[PDB]
Amino acid sequence: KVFGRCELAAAMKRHGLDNYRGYSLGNWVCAAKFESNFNTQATNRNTDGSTDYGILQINSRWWCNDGRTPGSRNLCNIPCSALLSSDITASVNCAKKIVSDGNGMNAWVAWRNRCKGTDVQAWIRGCRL
Template sequence: MKALLPRPLFLLASFVVAVQAKVYERCELAKRLKDHGMDSYQGYSLANWVCLAFFESSFDTEAVARNKDGTHNFGIFQINSGWWCTYSDTASDNLCEIDCQELLHPGIEHDILCAKRIVEDPQGMAVWDEWKTHCENQNLTEWVKGCHL
């Protein structure tokens, strides 16, 4: 006997399959970021962006982290729901004017646009603690080495 899912459940299952995470390879991400104008954006090298993405999400577009203050960080750059995007009923300034769920898609265009907005603020990349800890003032050439950009 063939079991069928009720229509709403079937549609939900289809949606889940359609928005599966993508974990980028280092050079694949570097190329995508370069193609979207991230190399030297606001003075930050492409290697800075790749380093940031690695330490924030391990290049995983579907990464989500819950913070102690109740906010969440989303996507490949771990963009915070308290400031940059809106999520559920969490209060947010939504400075990127985006729903946080958009930052979880395999295509990272929304993430890139929001990251560009973030680094335009006075703190620049220093808003990301992982960047300050692992990337700032470091030799980052290895992050793009061999990528043929």
């Protein structure tokens, strides 16, 4: 499933991401835009045998179980396949743990490279939230 920008913004706000850990909604929407282009089914294989899943590309090395990542942990306690659902809930809940893991939103390379220090409030433009 592919979210429209305001659609995802609404879904994110409903799940409590706006200003979660001091990170404004725009941050979250921007990250999702550059990590998966609002596509819940996005997957990206890494050269380390790990894979990134869903709208916020969570990594199989430590956060979810995909059963093919060698020294993998499952901190979020879920199948990586669940991160590929049309419903954002498993991703957001796991995202909440990742953002409090000591690097803030820097855990997402695309956020760091494309959103960090930017006017992220633009991502929320024309959205009735």
